[PDB]
Amino acid sequence: MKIADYGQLGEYTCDAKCDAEFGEPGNIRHLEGKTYDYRGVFCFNRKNLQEA
């Protein structure tokens, strides 16, 4: 999870205004990743490997 933003809600307003305003909400996001593969190979000869 990544919390991209928080946004702003409140504001300074007059006392006469009995209502209130709507702000801008935050913004949350989802992310993901992967893994990778490392591979190799090597070969021998039995007689040489035994005699060396």
């Binding site: 007059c14 006392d15 006469a16 205004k17 009995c18």
Partner: protein, 135 residues
């Protein structure tokens, strides 16, 4: 012997029948208008309320006029177009005075002028009163 009140409650001219003078309310935290008529009218005369904003070139010169928005109360209704206005009725007499104000400040300057210029509009005098310095 002196009981001077001009130090605590100054007054300024806002309309005199020929010209409208922007008034400054930045240094004060309350204010109100005052209407008086000097001769019999022919019909109601409506006024438009404006506020100005600090100019970009100079920090102490009023900008262009901006109309003041309305503010409805709890048990009440809004203006036809959402703006604020005051209308002086024809029943008023030469020996009376009327008072009124707006619920909110908006810009640091304020002004008032008639909707139209005519013979009737020249019979009304408007003045602005402050109620305390904060600086």
């Amino acid at each position: 012997m002196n009981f001077n009140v001009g130090v605590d409650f100054p007054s300024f001219i806002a309309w005199d029948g020929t010209t409208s003078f922007p008034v400054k309310i930045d240094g004060f935290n309350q204010f109100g208008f005052t209407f008086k008529v000097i001769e019999e009218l022919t019909a109601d005369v409506p006024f438009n309320i404006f506020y100005h904003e600090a100019s970009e070139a100079d920090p102490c010169v009023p900008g262009p006029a901006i109309r003041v928005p309305d503010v409805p109360f709890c048990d009440g209704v809004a203006t036809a177009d959402g703006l604020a206005t005051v209308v002086i009725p024809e029943a008023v007499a030469v020996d009376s005075f009327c008072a009124g104000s707006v619920p909110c400040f908006n810009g640091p300057w304020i002004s008032i002028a008639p909707v139209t210029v005519n013979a009737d509009s020249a019979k009304v005098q408007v003045t602005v009163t402050m109620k305390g310095a904060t600086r």
